[PDB]
Design a protein around this nucleic acid. Sequence first.
RNA 1: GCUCGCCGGAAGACCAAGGGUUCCUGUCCAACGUUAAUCGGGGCAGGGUGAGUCGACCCCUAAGGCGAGGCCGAAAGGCGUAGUCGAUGGGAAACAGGUUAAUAUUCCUGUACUUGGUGUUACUGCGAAGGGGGGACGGAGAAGGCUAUGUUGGCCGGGCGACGGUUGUCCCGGUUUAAGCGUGUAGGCUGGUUUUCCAGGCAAAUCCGGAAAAUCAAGGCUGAGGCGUGAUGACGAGGCACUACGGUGCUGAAGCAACAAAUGCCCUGCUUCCAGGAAAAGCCUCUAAGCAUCAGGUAACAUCAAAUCGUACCCCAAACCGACACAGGUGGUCAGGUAGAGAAUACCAAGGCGCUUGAGAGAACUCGGGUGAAGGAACUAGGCAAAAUGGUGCCGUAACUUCGGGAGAAGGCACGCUGAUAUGUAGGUGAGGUCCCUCGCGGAUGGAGCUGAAAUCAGUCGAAGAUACCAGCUGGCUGCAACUGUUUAUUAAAAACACAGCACUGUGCAAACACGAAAGUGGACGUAUACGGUGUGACGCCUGCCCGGUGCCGGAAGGUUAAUU
RNA 2: AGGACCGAACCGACUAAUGUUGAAAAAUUAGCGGAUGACUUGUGGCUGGGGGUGAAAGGCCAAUCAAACCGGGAGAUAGCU
Lengths: 46, 271, 93
Amino acid sequence: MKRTFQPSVLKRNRSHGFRARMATKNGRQVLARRRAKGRARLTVSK
Amino acid sequence: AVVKCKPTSPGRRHVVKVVNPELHKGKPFAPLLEKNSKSGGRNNNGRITTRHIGGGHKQAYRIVDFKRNKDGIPAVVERLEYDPNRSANIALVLYKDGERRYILAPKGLKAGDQIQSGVDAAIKPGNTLPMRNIPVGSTVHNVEMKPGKGGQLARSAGTYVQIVARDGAYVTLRLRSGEMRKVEADCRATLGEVGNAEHMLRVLGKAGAARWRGVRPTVRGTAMNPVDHPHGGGEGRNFGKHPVTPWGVQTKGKKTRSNKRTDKFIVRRRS
Amino acid sequence: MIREERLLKVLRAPHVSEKASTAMEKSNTIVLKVAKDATKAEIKAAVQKLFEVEVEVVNTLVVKGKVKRHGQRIGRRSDWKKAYVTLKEGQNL
RNA sequence: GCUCGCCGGAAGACCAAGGGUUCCUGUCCAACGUUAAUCGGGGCAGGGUGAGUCGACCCCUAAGGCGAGGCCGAAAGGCGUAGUCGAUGGGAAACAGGUUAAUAUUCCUGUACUUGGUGUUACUGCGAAGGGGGGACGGAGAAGGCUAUGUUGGCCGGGCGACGGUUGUCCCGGUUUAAGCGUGUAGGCUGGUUUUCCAGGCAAAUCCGGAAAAUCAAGGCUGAGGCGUGAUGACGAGGCACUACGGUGCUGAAGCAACAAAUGCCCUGCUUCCAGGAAAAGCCUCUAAGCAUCAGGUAACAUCAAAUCGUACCCCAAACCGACACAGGUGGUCAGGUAGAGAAUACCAAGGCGCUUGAGAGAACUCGGGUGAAGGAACUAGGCAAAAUGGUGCCGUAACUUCGGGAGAAGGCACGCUGAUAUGUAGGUGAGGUCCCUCGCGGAUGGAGCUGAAAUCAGUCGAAGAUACCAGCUGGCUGCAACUGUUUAUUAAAAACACAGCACUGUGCAAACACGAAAGUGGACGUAUACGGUGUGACGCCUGCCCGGUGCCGGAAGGUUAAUU
RNA sequence: AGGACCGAACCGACUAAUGUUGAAAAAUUAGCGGAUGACUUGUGGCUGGGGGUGAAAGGCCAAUCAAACCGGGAGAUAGCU
Ligand SMILES: [Mg+2]
Ligand SMILES: [Mg+2]
Ligand SMILES: [Mg+2]
Ligand SMILES: [Mg+2]
Ligand SMILES: [Mg+2]
Ligand SMILES: [Mg+2]
Ligand SMILES: [Mg+2]
Ligand SMILES: [Mg+2]
Ligand SMILES: [Mg+2]
Ligand SMILES: [Mg+2]
Ligand SMILES: [Mg+2]
Ligand SMILES: [Mg+2]
Ligand SMILES: [Mg+2]
Ligand SMILES: [Mg+2]
Ligand SMILES: [Mg+2]
Ligand SMILES: [Mg+2]
Ligand SMILES: [Mg+2]
Ligand SMILES: [Mg+2]
Ligand SMILES: [Mg+2]
Ligand SMILES: [Mg+2]
Ligand SMILES: [Mg+2]
Ligand SMILES: [Mg+2]
Ligand SMILES: [Mg+2]
Ligand SMILES: [Mg+2]
Ligand SMILES: [Mg+2]
Ligand SMILES: [Mg+2]
Ligand SMILES: [Mg+2]
Ligand SMILES: [Mg+2]
Ligand SMILES: [Mg+2]
Ligand SMILES: [Mg+2]
Ligand SMILES: [Mg+2]
Ligand SMILES: [Mg+2]
Ligand SMILES: [Mg+2]
Ligand SMILES: [Mg+2]
Ligand SMILES: [Mg+2]
Ligand SMILES: [Mg+2]
Ligand SMILES: [Mg+2]
Ligand SMILES: [Mg+2]
Ligand SMILES: [Mg+2]
Ligand SMILES: [Mg+2]
Ligand SMILES: [Mg+2]
Ligand SMILES: [Mg+2]
Ligand SMILES: [Mg+2]
Ligand SMILES: [Mg+2]
Ligand SMILES: [Mg+2]
Ligand SMILES: [Mg+2]
Ligand SMILES: [Mg+2]
Ligand SMILES: [Mg+2]
Ligand SMILES: [Mg+2]
Ligand SMILES: [Mg+2]
Ligand SMILES: [Mg+2]
Ligand SMILES: [Mg+2]
Ligand SMILES: [Mg+2]
Ligand SMILES: [Mg+2]
């Protein structure tokens, strides 16, 4: 049966990628929070 | 002509078609075409702002000369053509100078006929003259609001405008809706009616035919829940309220025109 | 015309394996480890300078490093570059 | 290794997406694998992905996104012009054979093709951020010509049979060859050509569009397939010798024809219909500025360049999505034989598998099936379930009907095999030979050979010939909904929703209305035969009385009444 | 010609049995509906939480919906257990 996660790298990158995050100040708030917590992986990019 | 189909299937029994053997069968004039992609009733915010719009057949926009601003040069009807974008038929005219344009096809105008625009043009169907030079009582279409702006009235199939009076800088027009409206005398008009008068005798016959024209289904407000329509609710079929729009405005007789900029130009509302 | 420092830097090591050997005997082809940023023209020039042999064509591919484990710890090797260069059937290197 | 069974429009093969070493070799069995494991997609180590032509990158655009200025907005920001990104679309070019343990249209052999740049030569009006052309486009339907492919015959190699027979009208196997180049065919479309004139294409233009004479009436564009060449080639059953028994080395006969034939090609064609069917670039062409014995354009030749990144492996699945080695889900391509209408179905080919616990026994009971005396719905809420019907051709078929239907109504007969008609028929295909000519992939004649229904008559086997698989139960009365559709993903598919049709009502265009503190946008590049809202719901016959209540529409005399003063 | 008919692929989901610590957090098996259309499907894009979208079931918006999810106000408040 068809489950919820249907992977696509292009769509993943366009929705949650580093450049998509940097495009808005709220995405930049996301990056700042994740940097402050100390996350080894800021985005889905890598 | 108007021909009804044979009931060889339930979706064909009530279909009534308008057939025009005179319309051209090939592709339209390519350099007078444009693309116009569909919106589905969405605006630049992406929100549905007009309901019941979506799908339908792909259509190409035919650039139609509504202004008719080629004065003096005679023109001949090359053919009459089908236009998906409007209820009226259109005509491809060839000007003596070598220029081709799409115009609204008036009633009775066949291929080979001469048309002309300007003050010097004669009182003939398809000719465009200032309403200053058009005699009182004439029947016109493709009527301008403002000089040089282009025809904005009486553009659909079988529609016309009558010139009722002329007083100074303004003529009175009895519009198709029944309204008496004042227009500057320098605004242009085209003699005759719009053709394809038998457009309104068509019977779609089936739901799919309406779907072909990009019309999505309409749901009655009383058929839904109160959370999404004032008409919603009831155990069984209940109404018990005054009919309103989906946004709460009384929808049977309440007048909605409010334009103080243009009340002066209305001699008499359609009533 | 490539600077000599660039040429002395673009050749890393010669690849040794059964496939490399068979290419050397049959097709007169040596297989080399090269810099990840080395082009085909640079490989040709460097082999012609530092090896004194004559090249006619260069073939390149990038090997991906393997994901390994050391003491139950994730670890990965580097992606390197490999070149097949065909020598002009008289060089004997 | 030999038998057995299963799939074979897949449970075979090849991709995309997604994954990331799961690929190959050696080695190990702790843990993992629902059992054991010497095995493994497990551990460990070593190896493996070769491109000018494939893909990305690249050029060009769609939806949409972002957006210098700009407009708007308490701030944050919103929208949008010029632009610039964005494929799921448009745009140059490679085939066949061989080869690894693992890569190949990438490596090798043979034979090709594209683009661009430089230089020599010859001729020569070049030149765009502009003009025009082209690219460039729907659905359905029909036919002809083909090929993919298959079947048979000939030919070539082999065989003479474990048990009656098998020198034959016998058995087995093979019978293959590409792009490119030359030919311009089946077929499609278009009247050419030369001058002159011109409010049109923002300026110009020889280009495009328009007009007028002359003259010719044959010129042009497009086009599958066939043939020639590519090819003295490669490939090829079989044979000879090594073997480490996996494979290695050498040679290699025939390699033709006829018939059948696609959902693939001609075909972006033709015909017809309405619901009227992207864009932009590459490409052709024209001039503007500018340059004008230089540049620049055309052709010949020569040389040089074509980078970078991907390429292993799975890919209807044990590697992707489902926590699992999970009866689930997952887009595209290929498409053999007999029977068959068929991609259904049954049995097989190529190829791939026997689903990672087994051994016994033959109790009750459960599950999945088969058969059943006599009865035949007596069961039960209810014929639930099961049983039953089931094909082709012909005969025949009621009420009612909106004249289309109902209807496959209902019901009935025939059906295998063999011989004759006719040593193979009707038909289809179609060589030779001959004849004509603007001589070729021509026409006319001709019929050898191949292929091949349907039917009639006679005879014959069985209980049974639509014999398996496959494959309508039928009829009568009535409620509701006109009908096809839609819906509670995961207890409700319906009489509910929608619907074509109808009515009321709003809306004169900077429309009403909707999303937006706004700018703007949708409505609509529409204009009252239009658009929005509401109710009803094909069609037929129709739709009666009430304006007191509450809405809404119109009015403005008299009373009441805000800020204000 | 046809929102025409029978019927595979494909899209669905009417009946029954099984399964109910399932092979499966909705399936299997035998039957069933549509199958040139208001059809179906791939790829990409837009609509955002009192908001979207809805041939309308309060349906669906990542196994969550008469107000999604994540964090925060926050140790809300709890005459109750
Ligand atoms: Mg509407
Ligand atoms: Mg309606
Ligand atoms: Mg309801
Ligand atoms: Mg309410
Ligand atoms: Mg009631
Ligand atoms: Mg009541
Ligand atoms: Mg099968
Ligand atoms: Mg591993
Ligand atoms: Mg074990
Ligand atoms: Mg053990
Ligand atoms: Mg393996
Ligand atoms: Mg392993
Ligand atoms: Mg490469
Ligand atoms: Mg090469
Ligand atoms: Mg700005
Ligand atoms: Mg913007
Ligand atoms: Mg671009
Ligand atoms: Mg693409
Ligand atoms: Mg392989
Ligand atoms: Mg053939
Ligand atoms: Mg087909
Ligand atoms: Mg591969
Ligand atoms: Mg298993
Ligand atoms: Mg599975
Ligand atoms: Mg599927
Ligand atoms: Mg098992
Ligand atoms: Mg038993
Ligand atoms: Mg039993
Ligand atoms: Mg039985
Ligand atoms: Mg019995
Ligand atoms: Mg009996
Ligand atoms: Mg009986
Ligand atoms: Mg009873
Ligand atoms: Mg009883
Ligand atoms: Mg039953
Ligand atoms: Mg049964
Ligand atoms: Mg009753
Ligand atoms: Mg119904
Ligand atoms: Mg349900
Ligand atoms: Mg507007
Ligand atoms: Mg109703
Ligand atoms: Mg009444
Ligand atoms: Mg008053
Ligand atoms: Mg149908
Ligand atoms: Mg559904
Ligand atoms: Mg159900
Ligand atoms: Mg089923
Ligand atoms: Mg049906
Ligand atoms: Mg069907
Ligand atoms: Mg309810
Ligand atoms: Mg949910
Ligand atoms: Mg709430
Ligand atoms: Mg607080
Ligand atoms: Mg608490």
